Design a protein around this ligand. Sequence first.
Ligand SMILES: *[C@@H]1O[C@H](CO)[C@@H](O[C@@H]2O[C@H](CO)[C@@H](O)[C@H](O)[C@H]2NC(C)=O)[C@H](O)[C@H]1NC(C)=O
Ligand SMILES: *[C@@H]1O[C@H](CO)[C@@H](O[C@@H]2O[C@H](CO)[C@@H](O)[C@H](O)[C@H]2NC(C)=O)[C@H](O)[C@H]1NC(C)=O
Lengths: 49, 49, 48
Amino acid sequence: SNIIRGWIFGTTLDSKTQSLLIVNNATNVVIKVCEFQFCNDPFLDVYYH
Amino acid sequence: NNLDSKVGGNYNYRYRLFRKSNLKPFERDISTEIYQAGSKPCNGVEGFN
Amino acid sequence: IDGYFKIYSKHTPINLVRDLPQGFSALEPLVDLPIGINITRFQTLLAL
Ligand SMILES: *[C@@H]1O[C@H](CO)[C@@H](O[C@@H]2O[C@H](CO)[C@@H](O)[C@H](O)[C@H]2NC(C)=O)[C@H](O)[C@H]1NC(C)=O
Ligand SMILES: *[C@@H]1O[C@H](CO)[C@@H](O[C@@H]2O[C@H](CO)[C@@H](O)[C@H](O)[C@H]2NC(C)=O)[C@H](O)[C@H]1NC(C)=O
């Protein structure tokens, strides 16, 4: 039933350096390599609303 | 010269002058953060050496 | 490796109870992309 979605990879994860995003939905993938600011425990859930 | 030079100097062009370790092949370090030349730890934005 | 990041994968159905199953097979490569970034850490994403 496809609970798993994607992965995150980096060195510092803190926008002082670049880091990379991998994600999935019903079929598609994006990969992106910005200086992402994340959080303590971010994720993607089913954002139904 | 004939397209990238400027009479006031084309100081848009910048390069890294200091690094802890020499980079790996095809690495790209975008960090603008401070470097230490004196033995003291340095914080924020400036220091002696 | 040296300017590239690359991914390999496989899928199989099984009926083993509660563990990573036995048997054998190998992963096919699915993509490569030059991110050039230094990497040291990672995480995985799941939905409610
Ligand atoms: C999976 O996610 C992507 C976006 O992350 C969706 O792609 C967009 O879909 C709409 C409608 O087809 C387009 O207007 C956008 O241009 C698409 N973006 C890109 C980058 O192509 C995609 O529709 C999602 N799929 C499902 C079924 O949820
Ligand atoms: C890739 O990123 C890692 C993590 O920032 C770097 O590892 C650090 O290296 C410096 C200098 O040797 C040390 O101060 C840190 O203690 C190291 N941390 C870890 C987790 O080992 C690594 O040097 C970077 N690689 C390159 C080629 O710049």
